[PDB]
Amino acid sequence: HRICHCSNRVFLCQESKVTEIPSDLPRNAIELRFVLTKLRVIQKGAFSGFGDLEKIEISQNDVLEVIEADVFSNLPKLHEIRIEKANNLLYINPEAFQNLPNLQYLLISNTGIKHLPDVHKIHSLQKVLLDIQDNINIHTIERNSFVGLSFESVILWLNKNGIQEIHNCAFNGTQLDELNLSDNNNLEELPNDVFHGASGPVILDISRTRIHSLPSYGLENLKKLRARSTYNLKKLPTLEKLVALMEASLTYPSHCCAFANWRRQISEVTCSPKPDAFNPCEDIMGYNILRVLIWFISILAITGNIIVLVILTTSQYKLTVPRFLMCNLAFADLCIGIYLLLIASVDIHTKSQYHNYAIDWQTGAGCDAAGFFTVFASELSVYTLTAITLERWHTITHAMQLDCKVQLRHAASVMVMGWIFAFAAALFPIFGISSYMKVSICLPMDIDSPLSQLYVMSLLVLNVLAFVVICGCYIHIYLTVRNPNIVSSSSDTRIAKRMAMLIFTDFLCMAPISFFAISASLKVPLITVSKAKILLVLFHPINSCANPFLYAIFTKNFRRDFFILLSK
């Protein structure tokens, strides 16, 4: 052919020279392919007479705008139809497709058509697989849209569509085998009578959709259900309706745990993701000993922080920069203890029934608040420890200047900046950067998205760098203090001892947790979720609880101040 290459009865028309369908193409051609054609409008009945045609492929039809009626008319052997890259194709003739008994595959992608093509006249005898995707212009599905597509079972691949609403009885009169509606961001709800008059679907794929709830009827024949990333699907229909449901791919491990409990009751379905120790359905704490110790630890931490703050504020002596740092550390410890007490209360309230309230707790504002509070407390404590270590190092190594030219105003400004940074970090999970609902302890373990993983890695790196800097400063201060060439003061020795104790406690509390978090972030979890929860419950608040006794209570001045206050 002059305009299209011919080989084994296959015509491959390409280039811009193809402004219209050539009428000279042999009627016996088996496959016709149009790539990067300049055709704007497809003439009606263009493919008429192509009895031997088996497959039709249209791609890169940027200039294509309209398809005339009866184009795909009276094709006995036409089994596969492919349309792609037809961005300008906004209008499709309703009667374009008709009389296709042997139709088996119909792929339409990258099309600007705002309405689904009318395939009622297809009347395909064999199974027809519909593959409609990248149809942003399509927003609604009319009733009986797929009616008359084919007599046998048909698979409707409608993923990557802009469908926002679905009318009742949309699939009525259709033998839906598998449905692929995933990637429908605008899909918010599905009518109950959507499947009325239809068969199946056997397999449903609603992953990455905003469907609030599934239809209460028509799912009896659903064998497989896919709802990955379907956050809006907080609650699913009763297991009784899904009798045929054999496999499930949801996005809420709590729902899978509830189904497992129902399976045990039935005994007295492969559902993923399976429950795990990160989000237990029995109890958040799990171990009775850990739950009992948690309340005591939280109470002790809160009492110690309150006592330290009261003593520091009521002290008659002048409030030094170290006093402000100790007050900030006590406030951070009190916040951590409050978060721990809230977690313990939540665990105790739902004892033996966490599974029922697991969804509410994880999705509730309480979990987000607890996670934000824990993150803010940890950031504030780290910043305060780093600032105290830096001030001590400047005072010791720069004995010429009291604190390397440091005053109360500078310390207050540094504390304010650290508090602002901690608040910003704690607000990140609330702003969609990762999520605290991924764990029952409200920890921001969500790293599925690149942004959340990057934020977690950055936080871990910052914590590690701060710890390393603090350790180096402490080592330098200790070396300087013991140097015989420098006459270290007794107050300097006491400050060094207190700083060493605080640094040792912080390192003991943080190093294991930091290492575990780093390992987990790299997709190499070296510890189970149950062990990690216990470690975070015990080690993390242990440092905060020991901070008062290590820093202030052990100090002679603090003891004297407490004794004076007690005399009042």
Author numbering: 20 to 287, 344 to 643
What did the paper state?
Follicle stimulating hormone (FSH) is an essential glycoprotein hormone for human reproduction, which functions are mediated by a G protein-coupled receptor, FSHR. There are three members of glycoprotein hormone receptors, FSHR, LHCGR and TSHR, which are activated to mainly couple the Gs protein and lead to up-regulation of the secondary message cAMP in cells. FSH acts through FSHR, which is mainly expressed in gonads (ovaries in female and testes in male). Here we report cryo-EM structures of FSHR in both inactive and active states, with the active structure bound to FSH and an allosteric agonist compound 21 f.
To obtain stable inactive FSHR proteins for cryo-EM structure determination, a small molecular antagonist, compound 2427, was added during FSHR expression and purification. Through numerous data collection, we were able to obtain a structure of wild type FSHR in the inactive state at a global resolution of 6.01 Å. The EM map was sufficient to place the receptor ECD and TMD, while the density of compound 24 was not observed. Due to the relatively low resolution of the inactive FSHR map, we only built a poly-alanine model for the inactive FSHR structure. In the inactive FSHR structure, the ECD conformation is closely titled toward the membrane layer and the TMD conformation is very similar to the inactive β2AR31. Structural comparison of the inactive FSHR with the inactive LHCGR and TSHR structures reveals that all three receptors have a similar ECD down conformation. The ECD of FSHR has a nearly identical position as the LHCGR ECD but a 7°–8° rotation close to the membrane layer relative to the ECD of the inactive TSHR. Interestingly, the hinge helix in the inactive FSHR structure is elongated and shows different orientation from the hinge helix in the active FSHR structure, highlighting that hinge helix plays an important role during FSHR activation. In contrast, the hinge helix in the inactive FSHR structure shows rare interactions with ECL1 by rotating approximately 30° counter-clockwise relative to the hinge helix from the active FSHR structure, thus confirming that the interactions between hinge helix and ECL1 is critical for FSHR activation.
